[PDB]
Amino acid sequence: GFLLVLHSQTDQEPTCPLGMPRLWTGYSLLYLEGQEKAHNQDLGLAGSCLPVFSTLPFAYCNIHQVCHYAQRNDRSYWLASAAPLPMMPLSEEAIRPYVSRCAVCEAPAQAVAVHSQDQSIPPCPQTWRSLWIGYSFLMHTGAGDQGGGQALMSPGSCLEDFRAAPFLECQGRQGTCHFFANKYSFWLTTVSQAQRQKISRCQVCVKY
Amino acid sequence: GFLLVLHSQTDQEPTCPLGMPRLWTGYSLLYLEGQEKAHNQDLGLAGSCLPVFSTLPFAYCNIHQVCHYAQRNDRSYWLASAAPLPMMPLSEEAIRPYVSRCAVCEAPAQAVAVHSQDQSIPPCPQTWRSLWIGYSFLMHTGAGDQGGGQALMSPGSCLEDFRAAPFLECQGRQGTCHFFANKYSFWLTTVQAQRQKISRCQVCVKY
Amino acid sequence: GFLLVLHSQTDQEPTCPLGMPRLWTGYSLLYLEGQEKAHNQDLGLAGSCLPVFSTLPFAYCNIHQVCHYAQRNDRSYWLASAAPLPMMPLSEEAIRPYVSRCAVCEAPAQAVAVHSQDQSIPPCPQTWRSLWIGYSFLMHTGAGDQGGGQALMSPGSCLEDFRAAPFLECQGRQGTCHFFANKYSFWLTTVSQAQRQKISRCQVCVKY
Amino acid sequence: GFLLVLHSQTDQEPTCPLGMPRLWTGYSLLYLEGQEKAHNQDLGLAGSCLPVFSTLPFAYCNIHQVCHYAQRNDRSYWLASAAPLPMMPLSEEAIRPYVSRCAVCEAPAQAVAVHSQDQSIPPCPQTWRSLWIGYSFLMHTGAGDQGGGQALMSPGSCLEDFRAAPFLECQGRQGTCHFFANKYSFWLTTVSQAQRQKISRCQVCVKY
Amino acid sequence: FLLVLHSQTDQEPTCPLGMPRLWTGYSLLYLEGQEKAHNQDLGLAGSCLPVFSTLPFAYCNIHQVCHYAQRNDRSYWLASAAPLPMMPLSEEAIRPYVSRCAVCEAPAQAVAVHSQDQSIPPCPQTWRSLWIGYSFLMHTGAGDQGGGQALMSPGSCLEDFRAAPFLECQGRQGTCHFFANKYSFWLTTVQAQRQKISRCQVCVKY
Amino acid sequence: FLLVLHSQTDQEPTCPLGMPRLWTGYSLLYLEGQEKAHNQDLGLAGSCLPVFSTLPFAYCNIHQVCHYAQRNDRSYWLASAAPLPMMPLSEEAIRPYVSRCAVCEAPAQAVAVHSQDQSIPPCPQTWRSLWIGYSFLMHTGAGDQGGGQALMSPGSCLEDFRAAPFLECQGRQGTCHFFANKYSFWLTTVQAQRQKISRCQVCVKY
Amino acid sequence: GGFLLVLHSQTDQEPTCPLGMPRLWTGYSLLYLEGQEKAHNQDLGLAGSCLPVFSTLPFAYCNIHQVCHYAQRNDRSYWLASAAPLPMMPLSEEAIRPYVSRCAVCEAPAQAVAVHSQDQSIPPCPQTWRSLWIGYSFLMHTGAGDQGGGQALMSPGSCLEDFRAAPFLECQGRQGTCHFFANKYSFWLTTVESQAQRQKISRCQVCVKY
Amino acid sequence: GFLLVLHSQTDQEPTCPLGMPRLWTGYSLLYLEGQEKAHNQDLGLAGSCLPVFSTLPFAYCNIHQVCHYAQRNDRSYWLASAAPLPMMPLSEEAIRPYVSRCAVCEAPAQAVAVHSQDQSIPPCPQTWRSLWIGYSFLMHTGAGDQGGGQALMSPGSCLEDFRAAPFLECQGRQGTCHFFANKYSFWLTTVSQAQRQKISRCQVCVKY
Amino acid sequence: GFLLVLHSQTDQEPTCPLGMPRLWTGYSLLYLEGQEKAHNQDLGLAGSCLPVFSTLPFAYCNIHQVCHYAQRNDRSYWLASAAPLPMMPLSEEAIRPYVSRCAVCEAPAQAVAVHSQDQSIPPCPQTWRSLWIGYSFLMHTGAGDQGGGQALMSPGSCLEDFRAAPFLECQGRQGTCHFFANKYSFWLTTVQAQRQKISRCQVCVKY
């Protein structure tokens, strides 16, 4: 009874590993602006795969007349698909095909990620079954609770596709989402596609 | 299982003890200015080995526009490498080869440090294998939660190399890091003129 | 294992009994001015034996540029050696030979103190080993949590040596320490060596 | 082992049941003026048996220059001996022979009280050892935490001597104590000595 | 485990055969405005108080000793089968109008079953029956242990139907009076009033 | 402008010739632990209370009506020239032992002058004299209107020296007793005790 | 009449008020209450710096602790020293009395100010003003508070008649003790053994318009 | 009875206008880090001219043992003299000759500043007396209380000397001060010394 | 004395009415997101004319390293100039010629605005001199402290030029400013299709 979360980084839903039942499908949510530091926002948690997309994930429900959202915060970040996004900002409707899809599955045991911090793909531990190879992705670099090194352990630190533009911003209070100004953000670097060469590799493993 | 942290005190990653899987590698963070009293800053914890260096570790992520850092506190201290560093306070780019590197490893048991509080090397417990010899380093001397003596039990109270200037300061809101004005700080004195005054220690594990 | 703490009441470090390994050596800290009730200040706890002596044990570290101490209170009490104290208050340097030394050791079991509340030496429980005899010392007399009776069970309530002037005070924000004006403070009386006779006696025991 | 507490209601120290080791001796403290609600003040707890008597039991220690007591609270109540108390108030020194003494012992199991709520002595449960008979005394009658009924379960609800003036009051800030104005206070009544007849009876039992 | 019985008379109830009686008291139903995390169920020992007073919020019943600070004053106690006059009474006059109760050590945890019609619901398969009654549900709000979850408690099953099941006590008035509303807190069906009320049974696995 | 007189007896003082009397009461010296911004000077009307009670902190003297919440209980009243027994008394017994007072409409603001020796200090140049006394300074701390500034008040000049100038009242005890200390609050010089005390005079510009 | 003027003798003798100004009262020179609120001003130019009764606990409303219980943390107090030299050990409320400076408060016809030269010369009083005393510039409140720094210089409190190696003492409240102050020449404003220091200190004068 | 403040921007004290008495002399303090927004830090206020220099202006007094400073803040800024400052940071002692001197004077009326927001020197109002010409300096640009436009009215917005490096930073907790990294900071610009040409001019006037 | 503020709605400073000294010149700030309720953001106040534009007006000064801005709030709205602005959200440098310019002047008396709430130009009071004709603009419509009608008394409720897009938004923590999605906002409707629907006003002073 363990959860494993998969981000396709495309507009297509991923399929769960053979022998793992699909629990639900969603949209890949990376980060919620000004949340509690008491809240973990790892891509490896169920909370990063949301069944319904909306520019206001902070609201309990998506009907303002029933659940009214009080706080100031309306910026949210979502991993992106491989479709290139126009400079002109977009609305809740037109943004959908640019958002990454995801799935959550019932895993026989807890999955962990291993990292080489060089260009080699690190091996899975001795008796474990391998699930995917990736590039190391570490957003939570601050010395917070679960941060830095501890985050590297989660399936959420290993994305399958290297990307110049790994994610997009959503303004809540405005109902808009647009591409991200900075490049190569949060990719963990090593101790043209010459950028891809600078990036740590990883593998996600499970004991079955 | 159990975690074991190594600080090289150099711009070179340490190697994990033969037989212990390496989990990650980073930079040696010693202290974050003014935190929750109960939150612990020991060199023996995984939290002291950060995969990415930045002059602002208080921020959740390293992009200002994504994670805004609200609080006042922006001082951080990092183990310096064996390099001699100039009088000019530097920035997040220049400072990198001056910061100590570190590694975290999965140990088979809980490692502990022993101290002699004199100039002799204290012996490891009866059936315990030895990992390293060092000098006693005790930053947390106040009578806080897990301070003083209880800090001496930690592998983080045993650094391999003595150094006049063991660490450096980083101003967050200034994006700058300089060398530390005071010398021979946090070393635990006895009950190369200084090397003599300093307690000696050893880190052991029951394998 | 468990912890045992010894206060020599002299400027020499005590040796651990019964072949118990010595963890470390320090100075005997009795009490911190205005601590929370949540923080216990017993002479039987490791936190009473500090590796480095400083007129300001409230600071996390002993360099003020690194660790700034924010708050009002800097009165600290340390146990005294047998050396007589001069009238003139003294700074962090000159006080050192006047502070009691201590040691912490890994004990096979939990040490308790027994008290007679008369002039006789009380016996250890049946199958227990005797560690030291002394005088009953009870600072924590208030009806707090861990107070009175409860504090009597601690090894910290049994000082080996009777003393007119058992401890001393340290003004932090003044960086000074001087003898204590009151005499025979905190000793537990019976239900000028005439004073010594009014004092309850105790023994510290462990089950080995 | 568990704690069992005994209040003599005289100036003499009670003796612990045969086979039960005496941990310490003290003075019977019934009630501290306006403590936190989370604070239990049962006569069955160690906290009611204080090794040192003072008119200010709120202060951590008994030397004001070391431990300063900030809160306003200064009244405290102590069980009384059989010796008649004069109408003229008294000081910490002169009040000593009027206060009850008490003992704490290591018991083989948890002691409980059984109450009849009539004039018959209730029996101990089937295989339990009897420790003493008394009169039902229930101070904590309000509907607070471990109050009312819950308190009757305590050995502290069963005092051996019926008394018109069961306790005395101490004003802290004054350093004074005087006999209590009200009579027959806190005795649990039944569903010259016509009063004794109106009182519930109890027995303290332990499983040995 | 504990079992609480409310007689709804001025006589103390007897514990079911086989269960030792721990104590006896007065039936307290509710204390005006207590912190949400505090449960006021008639199946808890806290509902059976050894001494009655118009001020149960005070730690002790001598106010020169225990001073009660907070504003909150009213309390409600189950009433006995006694005609209650119109004059708001005092602590002494009121005693014989209060229900008495008893707490017992039960060999297992007792539960109440409810039919929510006029029939007597059956005890579960190998369970002993303790009493039949009418469904009584004060805690209807969707608070912590509220609504249905309170229905599980033996405290939701009173043996005697009454038009005036309980009374009010003003604390800082030292006064208690009959209650203005009628048929309050009885759980109705999915005296012609007795007919509208759900029936219940309290069972234990012995 | 107001002028307050404390007789230190059980007789009400007379207002100085020419000044209308507004009311009469009992001499309240001090209320245990009140917010710093509240001044307790004997030269303020608040020190002369029309009704005496062992609980002046309550808005009214019927507690079923005005409930007093805060912990603070003790009050001190100037005592009359009456031998006080050792038994702590109640609100009724204590009345004839309390000083009485009167408040008057004065044509100008009265001030007290002090000599801080044994001599009687002279009134300022064209000022009328009202009374001679002994220097009395309770408010010695360096609080708001404290120390010397309190010396300006007519409330710092009592006509009668006394070893026991005042008494204590426990609120939630309904009790008042004589005070343990002696010669308290009298201002000393820069019964052999009367000799040690500074002398004063209360003057007004009429 | 009008305004207050405060005089600190820095001796055990009470000063006399100048120019026939009436004396309102006499007392002891209180310099500073430990960690008072920033909303309370502690200048030696205010009446509150001259206390009629000396106590090692001036935070208390009155000097009988059974009546006025003082609750808060703040303990220490500083009084201006007299000319007589102190011993090394702390002393009690009784012994310390002859070591505390005396003072007086007077009714002035106008508000008195202080002028400073910020060198070794004595600065002149304003044109039509009479001089009241010469001194040495003394500035405790140097922080950038509400009425601090240069603004405190305007106060007659910034001009002490007597230069002193040891201008004040400390009193530990909850200890009931007072002792000599370790530091020397503290709070004197400098110029842009004892004889050397005196030269480095700015001079002042306190003036009033009568 | 009005105050007028003069900053020499040299290590020499300024002289007050003829006919204005000098009240005191000091060091030019521009800004205190993390102060109340309830605190005005204008160069035109008396609070900007401090008689004693120290790296910790936040402390009531300059003896830590008497007035203990509690808050985190130790950065302070001071206008500079014309002496060029070395790259190596300096201490409270050696920094002194680099700090600007100032004076406060008694003015017959309130002085105001006028600004051209171009390269011309603006004239003083019709019957007013001119005191000095300057370059417009506006630090308080935020929409705070006295900020922006309102600050322009104060004598403090008109400095006599244009400067590449108008001020220096002082770290408190470290006891150090060093030159400032940014250039031409806070100079109000217009609607080689080609920088001086871009700067608004001003004049400070008084009604006499 | 009294202050009078003019907004040009162009990249050109307005001129003060003949006879009124100019005190300073700036940029038109309309609104700061989420302030102290009692703090007033009217265009008739000197606080609406800021000498230096920046995308972060909440900060005390415009240097991050000197004045750190702690609070969350970083949205600001500024009167746009008659320029048509592209779909790209711009930065603090690009945005400048798009911001309305303004002037503050010392007026001899208190200026007020009158409104007709129809399409006619309302007349100035009897012996009052006229300053400008405009369109009624009322942002503060909530029943706050000095809102609704009482805002209409202010010279700041009368802008000279009607405009479909009267203002722009600035994200502080993003250092960006873009055009506003909604159109015809804050104009006060009647009791060039839109110009007709809009109340007309005049600003008068008693000189």
Residue numbers in the entry:
A (entry chain C), C (entry chain B), D (entry chain D), H (entry chain C): 5 to 195, 213 to 229
B (entry chain F), I (entry chain F): 5 to 195, 214 to 229
E (entry chain E), F (entry chain E): 6 to 195, 214 to 229
G (entry chain A): 4 to 195, 212 to 229
Quote the paper:
Since all recombinant proteins used were prepared in NaCl buffers, and since hexamer assembly in the BM from bovine lens has recently been demonstrated to be chloride-dependent, the conformational changes observed in α2NC1homo and α4NC1homo that prevent chloride binding may hinder the final protomer–protomer assembly. Our findings of noncanonical assemblies for α2NC1 and α4NC1 homo-oligomers and the structural changes observed in the chains forming these noncanonical protomers in comparison to α2NC1α121 and to the chains in α1NC1homo, α3NC1homo and α5NC1homo could imply that chain folding is closely related to protomer assembly. It is unlikely that α2NC1homo and α4NC1homo could represent stable physio­logical assemblies, but the structures of the individual chains in these noncanonical oligomers might provide a frozen glimpse of transient conformational states in the process of NC1 folding and hexamer building.
Basement membranes are extracellular structures of epithelia and endothelia that have collagen IV scaffolds of triple α-chain helical protomers that associate end-to-end, forming networks. At the C-termini, interactions occur between the trimeric NC1 domains of two protomers, forming a hexamer of these domains reinforced by sulfilimine cross-links. Recent studies in one of our laboratories revealed that the NC1 domains function as recognition modules, directing the selection and assembly of α-chains into protomers and networks.
